Design a protein around this nucleic acid. Sequence first.
RNA 1: AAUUGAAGAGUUUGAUCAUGGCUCAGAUUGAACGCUGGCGGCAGGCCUAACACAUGCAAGUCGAACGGUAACAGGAAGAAGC
Length: 152
Amino acid sequence: ELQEKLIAVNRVSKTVKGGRIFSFTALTVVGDGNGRVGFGYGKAREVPAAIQKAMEKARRNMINVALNNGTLQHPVKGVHTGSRVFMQPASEGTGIIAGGAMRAVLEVAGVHNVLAKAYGSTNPINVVRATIDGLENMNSPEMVAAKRGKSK
RNA sequence: AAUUGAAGAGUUUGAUCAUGGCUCAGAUUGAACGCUGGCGGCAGGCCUAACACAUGCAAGUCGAACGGUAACAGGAAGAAGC
C-alpha cells in the first residue's frame, strides 16, 4: 500500500590506512498513488542495512503532490545540480514513456500518463531530486485560481 | 472519424559530482556475405565502367493516290495430257 521501490545501489570506498572500507549506498522511493512521494538515500556497511535505512528515510520527509486525475495539469521543467527533467501532461496514451530512475518515481507517484524526459548528466539521485522538486513546484488549477481570482 | 505527442545503459577515479567524447539497445535499404530453405500472392533486380560490343528484333502503313505488274489464287483471253 505504501508503494516502495528502490532504484539503484552503489558501493563506496574510504581508502583507510589499513586498506579500503567498502560501504554501500542505496536509493529508494515511496508513495501510494495519489501524491505523497518520498525518497531516501541510505548508507551502511551492507546492502540490506543500506536499503532498510533508505526506506526508513523515505518514510519521513514525504511531500505530497497536487496531481490531476492521472497526470499533471500543465507541463513543467525541473532543474537540479546536473540534471534537467521535462514533464508533459500527455493525456490518454495508455501509459507512461519515462526511462530509468524516472519511470520508477512516477509509477510510485501514481501518474499513469506523462511525457517524461531527462536532459543532462543521468545521475539517478540527481534526476530523482529534480523530479521531486518539479513536482513540488507544480501547482494545481484550484490553487492558482484561489490565489489569482479565478473568474473562469 | 484526416500527426494524441519524446525512455536509456556502460566507460576517466581509491570512491563523488560535472564537463566531455567513445560504445550499445530501434528502425530502415536497389543491400552484400555465411548457414539454412516448403509453397503462394505482391513488389524489386548493373548503385560500380555515360567501359566496348557478336548476334536477333525493336517504324512501317496506305492499291480507297499513282505508272505498274516480279509475284501468282488464279476464275478467267486462248489452247490442251482431255
